Amino acid sequence: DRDRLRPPLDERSLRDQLIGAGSGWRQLDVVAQTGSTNADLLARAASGADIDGVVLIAEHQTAGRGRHGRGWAATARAQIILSVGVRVVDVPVQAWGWLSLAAGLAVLDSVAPLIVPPAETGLKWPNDVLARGGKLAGILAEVAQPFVVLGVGLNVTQAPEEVDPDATSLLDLGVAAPDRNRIASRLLRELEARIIQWRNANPQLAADYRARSLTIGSRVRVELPGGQDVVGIARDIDDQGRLCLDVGGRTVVVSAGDVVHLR
Template sequence: MIDVKSGPWRIDRVDETGSTNADLLARAAAGEDIAGAVLIADSQTAGRGRHGRSWSTPPGSQIALSVGVSVGAVPSAAWGWLPLLAGVAVVDAVAEVAGVTAGLKWPNDVLAVAGRDVSAPGAGKLAGILAEVAAPAPVVVVGLGLNVSEAPDPAATSLSALGADVHRGPLTEAVLWHLDARIEGWRSAKGADAALAADYRARSVTIGNRVRAGLPGDRTIEGVATDVDDLGRLRIDTGAETVTVSAGDITHLRAVTP
């Protein structure tokens, strides 16, 4: 079981659950105020990803947690920044505690990769993030799974596989500290503040890459990911037009040579 200091959070820990996100959402639906709540699980048997994807993790192999974020003071159009700022928090915590360089694949993956070459040896998914709106309160549940000693997927990687020997307790504390700082800045600015936007761009391995985007309605586009906008949406230059993507599956094709 992970032992962490609570700081500004109200932390609950469980040995095993299906999904920490699902549990917090259920608590909100039952009438509990989950703003500021954190649920940490030693093992997840039905972890949740985008588009209903799920996975399981052996006990002690991941940091699996979800937090409830009060969003009532922030325009809903800016809520899309929450998974992005959570990614920045994870990247910074991993660098600080584990000494591992990671980058951000839009919109919700943390990759173990230095620079923007996602095909480099050792590159792989280190963490995934999922944000879901809770009902009825204006709260968003942000969940993350960070691979520490083992990866749930052969295409992914872990801190141990990258040579880092870390304990989950200090790393979890660092993740929560960075997450709180980023959320407070975002909430104060009622969206992405200048520091968050700049830090996200600096840590992105999608910006500058040629990508394929699978969009709603079975539409697919290819082009160069050039930036994220003020709402956290990805801008892709197809050569014929610039498309702003708010949701979709992104595949990195190759880095663009300057």
């Protein structure tokens, strides 16, 4: 079935394209299986390793992490499962929130042309990559000074029945034979540019995010950490990467939470 549409990644090829002159990526490894690529890179940094510009890709992830203590389901060779290390200590802490937003924009730009784009194809705050209403990719940013580990889970041929009822994949969107080697290459290249833009506070980063946001201008219900709900209209993203809500004339700024686009 879908397994035949899932050939293995070419580590040697990815290294030839992404490592060398003109590229910031220093190290790239493809492992057959791990618990969590985010956990692994955090473990490396915890033992003194310099993970800046280091890429770890897993064909399969058995104990995937999600935001707010949730999980991330996956089957072998059905997704692009990677984590990258980013040195952030040179950047003010108030701007670290934009790093995760930049990541989702990069993931989206890497797969957007492969799709015609149906309704609801863009970014849901924080960095949910949505397509036709379904969650195409999820991003997780975890802190390990002086680094931030950026995690990306992109559904390539992953069936929604195998992971989550609200999930979608490139295959379920119409992409017949998605090449994970091509996509991963474009992903990390888009990611490199966005990280550089974030590090230098490039205005275009925020501009490109707004142009691809599905949340801004929509009536939403935001489920805050702690279990409280806030209903209003998303208006803008501030300089810290936080969602600014219009609640009956009052401005409510949210740093973290789950966004639901309402009727």
